[PDB]
Design a protein around this ligand. Structure first.
Ligand SMILES: [Ca+2]
Length: 279
């Protein structure tokens, strides 16, 4: 399949080079997979989700996304126009309030929720969780992410937006999950992107167009935007049978575009997520 005039990040994920605008992908499109978006929620009624999105849990007085950032992330995972995996099922877990904040204890509960909740969902091709959030180092937050991963969920987490070593942030610093840095449309490391040995992969994170609340759309930037590209890619690859939750991060790293990014500090991987789709 070919989507013309796709957002640059989608085009990038199916290309060996920057500067193109068509997204190429297998028509399977993540059908039969599921992606949990653990965030401010998802506006499931957005036409872009085509009924494939649902809120499954909130820790607040509503499950509505009153912020937009969860909806944006979900859009990059699986919206019809802005998504990587255009036929995946999207499950929203609202661990962040409408100001985008959340206590670590709530975030941890949300991760444990997903590890159990997948047993109540139909995801024959596999389960992914996208965590576009973080904070200072916490062994408890890292352990929660590790449990989620261990339970059979491909966990993708944002590296963080501090232009610093991700070793000092959680869940970014958890070795067993897939930690995602951000790049821009000219293959530069995004100016805000964290880096370090704990990063596994980079994805498009600067100026990313996706869904927003009120049935709208929006371009924003962050490792939060890079993460759902990788989560969506994982779901897509699992539907194709290329990989599994336990080794998707390794598979993505092994099949990535290599050595193409600029301003990658010595000791950080120079790997950009790539679907290796040959039309
Ligand atoms: Ca890792």
């Amino acid at each position: 399949a070919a989507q013309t005039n796709a957002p640059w990040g989608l085009a990038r994920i199916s290309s060996t080079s920057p500067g193109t605008s068509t997204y190429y992908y297998d028509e399977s499109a993540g059908q039969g997979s599921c992606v949990y978006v653990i965030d401010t929620g998802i506006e499931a009624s957005h036409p872009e989700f085509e009924g494939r999105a649902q809120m499954v849990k909130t820790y607040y007085y509503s499950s509505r996304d009153g912020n937009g950032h969860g909806t944006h992330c979900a859009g990059t995972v699986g919206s019809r126009t802005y998504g990587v995996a255009k036929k995946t099922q999207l499950f929203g877990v609202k661990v962040l309030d409408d100001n985008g904040s959340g206590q670590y204890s709530t975030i941890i509960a949300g991760m444990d929720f997903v590890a159990s909740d997948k047993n109540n969902r139909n995801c024959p091709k596999g389960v992914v969780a996208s965590l576009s959030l973080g904070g200072g180092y916490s062994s408890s937050v890292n352990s929660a992410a590790a449990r989620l991963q261990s339970s059979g969920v491909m966990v993708a987490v944002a590296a963080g937006n501090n232009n610093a070593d991700a070793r000092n942030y959680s869940p970014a610093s958890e070795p067993s999950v897939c930690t995602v840095g951000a790049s821009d449309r000219y293959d530069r490391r995004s100016s805000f992107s964290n880096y370090g040995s704990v990063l596994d992969i980079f994805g498009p994170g600067t100026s990313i167009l996706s869904t927003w609340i009120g049935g709208s759309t929006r371009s924003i930037s962050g490792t939060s935007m890079a993460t759902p590209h990788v989560a969506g890619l994982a779901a897509y690859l699992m539907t194709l049978g290329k990989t599994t939750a336990a080794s998707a991060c390794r598979y993505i790293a092994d099949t990535a575009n290599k050595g193409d990014l600029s301003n990658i500090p010595f000791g950080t991987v120079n790997l950009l997520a790539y679907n290796n789709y040959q039309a």
